[PDB]
Structure formats: structure tokens, C-alpha cells
């Protein structure tokens, strides 16, 4: 699959050899071309994966994620060139280099056949993200956010490494195919319980799980717009992909080791949906929305059924697109008024009608309106949970109401009412921002047209 990896490593020197005023054009054009190339991975089989070599393979679960990453890179490039206009040429090239390196690490992570290689790449993704957050963030909290982003990850991932090597000294292989075929049940002992915890906690903290999520609001609020985009749409799905991969060796311990995490996921989904109802920061509201959706995904992965896995895959794809769109929509208003408070700029539908339409579509998709893929994933997960236990329909149902409320709340706070009188610097929407919104929203409904592409291997 080097036909995708090599063009990114070629994006690197092309950016570093570009003329000072042509970096954005070249980067965007060739990133779009790389996305078009990566579109060919959607042609999957029904029985096994695409085993390209001893190192890399593609599956029906990782191909949509790869397509989403390669599609997200150009969107980040367009969203970044506004607030980086005054930067020097060298620092702009460094920023683009960080973005390209992040894409390369994510591409190699989603296709690694080996669990230690997966760990190495899934840990290497931290350095570009941390550098971006702590160098190009705007306020003084960013430094603290970086620390919160770093150690929260590492404290979860360092035990996993130990567990991984332990497994390789017992079974002799960490290759995913051999691991799947030579799978054996896990007994009920304290050592197996702690091995389960070591294998699970890293991906549960990257989701993030409720109670372990405190890093996410900081990281997604103090980051630049591209950083928030990549953190919310792709980097949160590393936990889901890793859990879906690693759960093949944890049965039947999961059958009873999932209870605390299931309880945390459901109650914290309710809790974060409620938190969204009282939020003075517009970016924090989107961050907590991400927390709630990822709690739903955690439940789906933890109950371990084919319908749950299908719904979880669809929900990850839909959430990535939707949250990236919401972050960009909030960043437009921030760039206009230089403040993140939701009740500062009001009645924006009067001043920006097409932006109000984009806001309406994003909010309608966030609350899982049929037949959007958000709804497909949510409904599949809810049906699987109902099969798991009939009482869950209470909590899930509760969430379905609360989400809608806060979603429309945001819209009604930002677009309706009367405009603030003293704010007179609201210029007409640029073609770049409208194109960004359209390129976010059109793929969502296009995938709604053909939903089996994002339903995962269990389809």
C-alpha cells in the first residue's frame, strides 16, 4: 500500500521546496489527489482483508478511517491558512510538516499488521499533535493542555506496552492474523484481570472514557483549528480501532470485565449531555458532545455483537465528519469576533444566511436525523443494547432527548434572536469557508446514499 504512503513522504519535500507563496496551493492539490488515490481501498472482500505485505494490510474497518484521514488533511490545510497569514515562511512550512507527519503516522497506524508496530505509530502520533498544540495555540492554557494531553495518554499506554511484550513471550507472535486464528480463552485469575486492564486502559483513555476524559476539553479548546479537527475526527477513533482489534484475545473475561466501563459509559454519556446544556464556551460544548458520542461507541464495542460493531463503525465515521464541521463553524465566528463565548455574537442568521444554513445542517446531523449515518450508527447501537438488556432503552432514550436540546440550543443561541448591537466587524462569508462547509457536509449525505461502505467488517 506504499502507493499511498510514499506520496505523503513526497508531500514533505514538495512543501519544503515550494516557492514562498505557493505552499498552500501545492499542498491542497496533492492532498486531494492522495485522497482520490486512497478512495480505491473501499473495494473490500467479504471473507478476509487485503494483505498487501508482511507489514501492512487493509480491512473493511480501517479503509473508511484511512479515507477520512486523507480527506481531512486538505480540509485542515484550507482551515489553517487564514490565521497563519502573518507567520513566516519557515514556520508555515513547519506547520505543514507537522500536519503531513501526523497524516503519515495515522496512515501507518491504521494498516499495521503488528501490534508493537501499531503501538509505536499510535504513540508517535503524540509528538506532532503536542508540538502543534503547545506552539501554535493562542492562549497561555495551551502549555498545561499539552501536559494534560501527554501524560494522560502515556500513563495509559506504557502498561499496554508491557502487556504487549508479555503476550509475545507467551504466544510467540503479535501479528494480528495469527493472533486471531490462534486465539484461546482467557481464564479467570488476577493475572488475567490485570492483563485485561493493561490491554484495555490505553484505548479507553484515548476514547476518552468518562472519568478519564479531563484532558479532552483542554486539548480541544486550546488547540488551533486544524489541531481540534484532527484531535476530534481521527485521533479519538484510535481508541475505538484499537479496542475492536485487541478484544479478540480478551474473551471471555470481557463478559464480566465490561460492567464498570459500561456503567461509566452510560451514566457519563448522560452526564456529559447534561453538561452541554450549561456551557458558556462554544468549543467546550462540541468537545463534550464528542465525549457523549464516544461513550456510545464504547458501549457498542464493549457489548461485543455484530450489530454493535456495525453501529460503532458508522458512528465513528459520522462523528468525525460532524465534529470537524462543528469546530470549523465555531472557528469562523471566533476569527470574526476573537472570543469563544456563545452568547457574545447572537442573531447571526440575519447577517450570514448561508452560514446559518450550514449551522442548521450541522446541528440536524448532530442530533441524528434520519436517514443520516449518525442515526444509522446510533440506532444499530441502541438495538444491540436493547438485546443486551431491555432497561438500557431508558438511558439511551434519555440521551436522545438531551442531545437534541443542547444541539438546537447552540443553534438558537448563535443564529436566532437579535444581533448584538456593538459588534460591527462581521464581514460577509468568504468563498473558502463556504467551500469548507460544503466539502464537510456533502460526503455525509453521499455516504448516507451508500451506507454499507462505513458499516465495517461485520456487514
Amino acid at each position: 500500500m506504499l502507493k499511498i504512503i510514499i506520496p505523503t513522504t513526497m508531500l514533505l519535500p514538495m512543501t519544503w521546496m515550494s516557492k514562498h507563496n505557493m505552499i498552500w496551493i501545492n499542498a491542497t492539490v496533492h492532498s486531494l489527489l492522495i485522497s482520490l488515490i486512497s478512495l480505491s481501498l473501499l473495494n473490500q472482500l467479504g471473507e478476509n482483508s487485503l494483505n498487501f505485505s508482511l507489514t501492512f494490510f487493509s480491512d473493511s474497518l480501517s479503509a473508511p478511517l484511512l479515507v477520512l484521514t486523507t480527506w481531512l488533511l486538505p480540509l485542515m490545510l484550507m482551515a489553517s491558512q487564514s490565521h497563519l497569514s502573518k507567520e513566516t515562511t519557515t514556520r508555515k512550512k513547519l506547520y505543514i510538516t507537522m500536519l503531513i507527519l501526523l497524516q503519515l503516522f495515522l496512515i501507518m497506524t491504521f494498516t499495521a499488521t503488528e501490534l508493537i508496530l501499531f503501538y509505536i505509530l499510535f504513540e508517535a502520533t503524540l509528538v506532532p499533535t503536542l508540538i502543534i498544540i503547545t506552539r501554535w495555540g493562542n492562549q497561555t492554557e495551551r502549555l498545561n493542555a499539552g501536559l494534560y494531553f501527554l501524560f494522560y495518554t502515556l500513563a495509559g499506554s506504557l502498561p499496554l506496552l508491557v502487556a504487549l511484550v508479555y503476550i509475545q513471550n507467551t504466544t510467540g507472535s503479535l501479528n494480528f492474523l495469527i493472533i486471531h486464528y490462534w486465539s484461546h480463552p482467557l481464564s479467570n485469575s488476577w493475572s488475567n484481570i490485570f492483563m485485561w486492564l493493561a490491554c484495555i486502559m490505553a484505548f479507553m483513555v484515548k476514547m476518552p472514557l468518562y472519568g478519564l476524559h479531563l484532558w479532552l476539553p483542554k486539548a480541544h479548546v486550546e488547540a488551533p483549528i486544524a489541531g481540534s479537527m484532527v484531535l476530534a475526527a481521527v485521533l479519538l477513533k484510535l481508541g475505538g480501532y484499537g479496542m475492536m482489534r485487541i478484544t479478540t484475545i480478551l474473551n471471555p473475561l470481557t463478559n464480566y470485565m465490561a460492567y464498570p466501563f459500561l456503567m461509566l459509559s452510560m451514566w457519563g454519556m448522560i452526564m456529559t449531555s447534561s453538561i452541554c446544556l450549561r456551557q458558556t464556551d462554544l468549543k467546550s460544548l462540541i468537545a463534550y458532545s464528542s465525549v457523549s458520542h464516544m461513550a456510545l461507541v464504547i458501549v457498542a464495542i464493549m457489548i461485543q455483537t455484530p450489530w454493535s460493531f456495525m453501529g460503532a463503525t458508522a458512528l465513528m465515521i459520522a462523528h468525525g465528519l460532524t465534529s470537524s464541521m462543528l469546530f470549523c463553524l465555531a472557528n469562523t465566528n471566533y476569527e470574526r469576533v476573537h472570543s469563544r463565548t456563545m452568547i457574545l455574537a447572537r442573531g447571526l442568521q440575519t447577517l450570514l444566511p448561508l452560514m446559518a444554513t450550514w449551522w442548521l445542517v450541522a446541528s440536524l446531523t448532530n442530533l441524528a436525523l434520519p436517514p443520516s449515518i449518525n442515526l444509522i450508527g446510533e440506532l444499530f447501537i441502541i438495538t444491540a443494547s436493547f438485546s443486551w438488556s431491555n432497561i438500557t432503552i431508558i438511558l439511551m432514550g434519555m440521551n436522545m432527548m438531551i442531545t437534541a436540546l443542547y444541539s438546537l440550543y447552540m443553534l438558537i443561541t448563535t443564529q436566532r434572536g437579535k444581533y448584538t448591537h456593538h459588534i460591527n466587524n462581521i464581514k460577509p462569508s468568504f468563498t473558502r469557508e463556504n467551500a469548507l462547509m460544503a466539502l464537510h457536509i456533502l460526503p455525509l449525505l453521499l455516504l448516507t446514499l451508500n451506507p454499507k461502505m462505513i458499516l465495517g467488517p461485520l456487514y
Binding site: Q349, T350, L351, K418, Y419, H421, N424, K427, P428
Partner: protein
């Protein structure tokens, strides 16, 4: 809405407000015109019976009983004018009110239409720009040294002055803008 409020309401002001509220709610109770006129005359006589009370304490005590009686006997669903703060059309047209500064961002193709309107707009903007320094100086002169004590603003007194802080009052969007 146009007048600057005071630090407090006088006794006479409170009595007048209670009289108006009682009349309106009684009209809400008495739908027909002749019945309303009858009971409004009765209410007027009831009000002017105690008009000549020299004891202020007893006057405010009578007002207290009047407010208690009104709150007990108020109409639960009083008539509200459609554009009043409780009416069915209170803020119906606020979505059509667009601030004037938006016109500063129109494309030159849009400004190619309506040339004379934009010429008049340029004249108004120039007048505001010339006027601003004087408006600030007048407010500086007329202000007591311990800051303003009310929200009232002075008029223009000089030969060709303009009343200070006039731009956003004069250029209100409209009552029926679109």
C-alpha cells in the same frame, strides 16, 4: 422606552400606574363597551374618594390594600396589544431589522445600483465624522465631576451642533424594515 428612568417612583406615579392597570384589567373582565364604561366610572369614583388625604402614611396603606385587591382580582388572561411585550406580534419583525453598517460591506456591483442613496449615505457619514469631536467635548463639559447621576443626555446648544450620541438613535432600522 424613550425617557430616562428616575431613581424611584413617586407616590402619585404609583397610584396612577395602579389606576391604569386596574382599568385595563377591568376592561378585560367587562368585554362589552357600555358595561365597561359603567364599571370604569365606578372605579374612577372609588379612586377619587380618597384623593384628598393629607396623611401620607394612611395614603400608602390604602395603596397597599389597593395592590392586594388588584392582585387577588386581576384577570388571569388580560388583553395585550399585539405589539406589546406580551402580545402575539411583540418581536415579529426583529428578524428583518438589519444594521446600517452592513451596507459598508456590499460589493461594488451591488453599490452600482442605488447610486444616489449611497451618495446620501456618504454625506451622512461625513456629518457624523465632523460632529463627533464636538459631541465628546460637550459631554465632557456638561458632566458633573463625580460622574453622571442619570441617563439623560443634553441637547445641542451651539450654532451648528448636533445632540451628543445621536447616530444610533437617528439611524434606527425601522418598525417594519422589510
Amino acid at each position: 422606552a424613550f425617557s430616562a428612568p428616575a431613581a424611584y417612583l413617586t407616590h402619585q406615579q404609583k397610584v396612577l400606574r395602579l389606576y391604569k392597570r386596574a382599568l385595563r384589567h377591568l376592561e378585560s373582565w367587562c368585554v362589552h363597551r357600555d358595561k365597561y364604561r359603567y364599571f370604569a366610572c365606578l372605579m374612577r369614583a372609588r379612586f377619587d374618594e380618597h384623593k384628598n388625604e393629607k396623611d401620607m402614611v394612611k395614603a400608602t396603606q390604602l395603596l397597599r390594600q389597593a395592590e392586594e385587591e388588584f392582585w387577588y382580582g386581576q384577570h388571569p388572561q388580560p388583553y395585550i396589544f399585539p405589539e406589546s411585550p406580551g402580545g402575539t406580534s411583540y418581536e415579529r419583525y426583529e428578524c428583518y431589522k438589519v444594521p446600517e453598517w452592513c451596507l459598508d460591506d456590499w460589493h461594488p456591483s451591488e453599490k452600482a445600483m442605488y447610486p444616489d442613496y449611497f451618495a446620501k449615505r456618504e454625506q451622512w457619514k461625513r456629518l457624523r465624522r465632523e460632529s463627533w469631536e464636538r459631541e465628546v467635548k460637550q459631554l465632557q463639559e456638561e458632566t458633573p465631576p463625580g460622574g453622571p447621576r442619570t441617563e439623560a443626555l443634553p441637547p445641542a446648544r451651539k450654532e451648528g451642533d448636533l445632540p451628543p450620541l445621536w447616530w444610533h438613535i437617528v439611524t434606527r432600522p425601522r418598525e417594519r424594515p422589510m
